[PDB]
Design a protein around this ligand. Structure first.
Ligand SMILES: CC(=O)Nc1nc2ccc(-c3cnc(Cl)c(NS(=O)(=O)c4ccc(F)cc4)c3)cc2s1
Length: 820
């Protein structure tokens, strides 16, 4: 009867039950600790609302979508068997108000989405999406899905550590470095004598630290590092000094260490290397008045600075002395708690007194940017971090999905496997099938390709699955099977490597074979859990010309009520880290919803992209779209004598009518403006011509973000000749272009803090290469912190006037680079 546990293993892609790589019982304690939060949210959720999961928002409907509505009236076409009749509806009308307009529940045609619950129809996401693209809200009169399908299975000494020695099975002078750590701050540091580097080095040394046992804070790491020499860090490993039972660590440790290929999230992990046979190990032993004017200004200038501006000792001493004034400002919080001398018992006590009186904090409107900072690598105190998770509680489900990726990554900054943030995600996952779905893949993604955090994420996922219900479990099981069957086919085809013609039949042969053998004939599309894909479309399946040879696959829609003929196009790629692409795209989504708060819609295409396993995942195929290079290839040819008039020409020939050409050119100016701003800010602006795409309908969009004389971003004359210009001129559309860009840019600057943090966290948990202070401190320059609105406008307009002044130089330089 434990085959349920064996199933969970195969759904997770890691066995929680295994204990070959522990040196204590933290993981198991956290399994057993999560049972309560699991069963609480399970028991408290509404069965029917959980089944239908209405994807709803509570946000204002922006200016752009109102001016689309035909005067306080919205048409909704309802379907029976084949009896479609349209109905007049007012933005405020309830799903209930339309059910007694003419127990049956409304379901979107084609999708596994529902229009139910006490919110107006203007508050449903599906409706807002129809209007966005200008489409009609078709919906079937259905039976509510059965909740039964969702059912669940039921002391004043100084600290000291003895370094016995290091041991490596295989393989010129080496020394161990021991740091008492706390939130990236190193509190005390001791070194060994440097011995000769051989497969085994013994020291038998007591390293006396100056910090006392009482002064140790919970969440402090003993960080053991190995340097050789000209010095270089070669190996690292960590050990929580205070354990999950608030107990001081004691005894003998043989800890297997991580190697090395500046901040990186992997460097913080309490996980030990699972590879006993190849990794370096270490052997250790634990036995053991109210303020004046001039200063208020100084304090307020400090509070004003961006999250990345370093505080000096002077700044910190001031913040701490004025604890209580600093407390009256929610924005002082990250700076204030980074002024705490965490390696001093009485100070932390005072810090806790200060926390116990956070009336201003608790009453303030949620600031996601501010909250995030408290969950990054700079904070190891659980009580500090808990006030952040506290603030997240108020997020509506719609806003969790916006931040879900980075909150899931934020877990890599937690000292302990059991944390407020982990419980939060768990809770908010079990309450909403949608958050649940994505939470599953997000965790699975990291479990597959990261040893530093798989053990932890696996515990959190198992906790989630044990509460999602039989329906979800079946769905998940079905999704895994498919991508596991398909990934095998991708790896095999890549090995038969220009694309052969016989190899297309090789692919089509194996896809036919799977159609019978084991493949489930329907599954949820992981990047769009609304859509259920069914049987394949073998004729349309191929291998793309790309040298990473990905699978272009198309699927029939398994839902008969689907009111379309279009297949479901998924790319299957191996060879790249798609985790990076997810992050960028999710930031892109954040950028959009920001622009929504100011009634803008810059028509980005942040297509679906899920990293399913090790260096291999899947991607949404945008319909009726092609790359900019191919447009230049069909008129100009191979070598690329880039012609300025080809794009607008291509837009004309894909525009059916004059009516559609206006809205196409207009969607280009919008989408182009967004991608120029977004990429400039993220520093992924200077991009190859073949990495940018357009839809037949005007929508531009960048692809392949994981791909990473210069230029700010991509603004070329062929783009500009859709904006009545070349070299030196100004049209009514180019004025609009600048009028959208400069407003998009200072619009992001109204959210500087948030993007800075999101950027930091992205580099630390997802870009495992360089990421030093300097890497991160690019977005400060890009967003011109401190600079006024007027100066920054001229900064961005100069960027344009570099792309203008560069013409084709950079695109051309890519050609001599990539192609030749
Ligand atoms: C109608 C049509 O063709 N629509 C498309 N829609 C999308 C949506 C996304 C992507 C895409 C995005 N990111 C990465 Cl990393 C990739 N990787 S890839 O290897 O498939 C690829 C790398 C470059 C290159 F020029 C073509 C494909 C692919 C490609 C396409 S094609």
């Amino acid at each position: 009867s434990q085959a349920f546990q064996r199933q969970l293993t195969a759904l997770i892609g890691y066995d929680v039950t295994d204990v070959s790589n522990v040196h204590d019982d933290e993981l198991e304690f956290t399994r057993r600790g999560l049972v309560t939060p699991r069963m609480a949210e399970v028991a408290s959720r509404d069965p029917k609302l959980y089944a239908m999961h209405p994807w709803v928002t509570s946000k204002p409907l922006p200016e752009y979508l109102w001016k689309k509505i035909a005067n306080n009236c919205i048409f909704i076409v309802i379907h029976r068997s084949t009896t479609s009749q349209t109905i007049k509806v007012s933005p405020d009308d309830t799903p209930g108000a339309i059910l007694q307009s003419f127990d049956f529940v409304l379901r979107v045609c084609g999708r596994d989405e529902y229009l139910v619950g006490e919110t107006p129809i203007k508050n449903f996401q599906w409706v807002r999406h129809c209007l966005k693209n200008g489409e009609e809200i078709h919906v079937v009169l259905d039976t509510p899905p059965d909740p039964a399908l969702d059912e669940v299975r039921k002391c004043d000494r100084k600290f000291r550590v003895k370094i016995r020695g290091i041991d490596i099975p295989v393989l010129l002078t080496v020394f161990v470095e021991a740091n008492i750590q706390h939130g990236q701050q190193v509190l005390c540091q001791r070194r060994t004598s440097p011995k000769p580097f051989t497969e085994e080095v013994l020291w038998n040394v007591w390293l006396e630290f100056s910090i006392k046992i009482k002064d140790l804070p919970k969440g402090a790491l003993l960080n053991l590092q190995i340097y050789c020499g000209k010095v270089q860090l070669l190996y690292y490993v960590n050990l929580l000094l205070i354990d999950h039972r608030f107990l001081l660590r004691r005894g003998e440790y043989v800890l297997h260490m991580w190697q090395i290929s500046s901040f990186n999230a992997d460097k913080l992990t309490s996980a030990t290397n699972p590879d006993k046979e190849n990794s370096m190990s270490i052997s250790i032993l634990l036995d053991n008045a109210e303020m004046p004017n001039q200063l208020r200004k100084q304090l307020e200038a400090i509070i004003a600075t961006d999250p990345l501006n370093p505080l000096t000792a002077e700044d910190k001493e001031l913040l701490w002395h004025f604890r209580y004034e600093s407390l009256k400002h929610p924005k002082a919080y990250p700076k204030l708690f980074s002024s705490v001398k965490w390696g001093q018992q009485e100070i932390v006590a005072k810090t806790y007194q200060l926390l116990a009186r956070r009336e201003v904090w608790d009453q303030s409107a949620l600031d996601v940017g501010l909250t995030m900072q408290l969950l990054d690598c700079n904070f190891s105190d659980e009580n500090v971090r808990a006030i952040a998770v506290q603030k997240l509680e108020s997020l509506e489900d719609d806003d969790v999905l916006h931040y879900l990726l980075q909150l899931v990554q934020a877990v890599k900054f937690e000292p302990y496997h059991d944390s407020a943030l982990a419980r939060f995600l768990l809770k908010r996952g079990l309450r909403n099938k949608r958050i649940g779905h994505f939470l599953f893949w997000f965790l699975r993604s990291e479990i597959a390709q990261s040893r530093h955090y798989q053990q932890r994420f696996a515990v959190i996922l198992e906790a989630y699955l044990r509460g999602c219900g039989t329906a979800m479990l079946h769905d998940f099981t079905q999704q895994v099977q498919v991508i596991e069957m398909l990934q095998k086919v991708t790896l095999d085809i890549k090995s038969l490597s220009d694309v052969s013609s016989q190899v297309i039949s090789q692919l089509k042969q194996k896809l036919e074979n799977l159609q019978n053998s084991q493949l489930p004939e329907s599954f949820r599309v992981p990047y769009d859990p609304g859509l259920k894909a069914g049987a394949l479309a073998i004729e349309k399946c191929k291998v793309m010309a790309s040298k990473k040879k990905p699978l272009w696959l198309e699927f029939k829609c398994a839902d008969p009520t689907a009111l379309s003929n279009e297949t479901i196009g998924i790319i299957f790629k191996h060879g790249d880290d798609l985790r990076q692409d997810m992050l960028i795209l999710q930031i892109l989504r954040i950028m959009e919803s920001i622009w929504e708060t100011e009634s803008l819609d810059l028509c980005l295409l942040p297509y679906g992209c899920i990293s399913t396993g090790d260096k291999i995942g899947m991607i949404e195929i945008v319909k009726d779209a092609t790359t900019i290079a191919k447009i230049q290839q069909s008129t100009v040819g191979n070598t690329g004598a880039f012609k300025d008039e080809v794009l607008n020409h291509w837009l004309k020939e894909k525009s059916p009518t004059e009516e559609k050409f206006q809205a196409a050119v207009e969607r280009f100016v919008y989408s182009c403006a967004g991608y120029c701003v977004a990429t400039f800010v993220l520093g992924i602006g200077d991009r190859h011509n073949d990495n940018i795409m357009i839809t037949e309908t005007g929508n531009l969009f960048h692809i392949d973000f994981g791909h990473i004389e210069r230029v700010p971003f991509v603004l070329t004359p062929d783009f500009l000749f859709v904006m009545g210009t070349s070299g030196k001129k100004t049209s009514p559309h180019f004025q609009k272009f600048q009028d959208i860009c400069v407003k998009a840019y200072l619009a992001l600057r109204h959210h500087t803090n948030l993007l800075i943090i999101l950027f930091s966290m992205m580099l630390m948990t997802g870009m495992p290469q360089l990421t030093s202070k300097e890497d991160i401190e690019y977005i400060r320059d890009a967003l011109t912190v401190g600079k006024n609105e007027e100066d920054a406008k001229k900064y961005f307009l100069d960027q344009i006037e570099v792309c203008r002044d560069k013409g084709w130089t950079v695109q051309f330089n890519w050609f001599l680079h990539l192609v030749l």
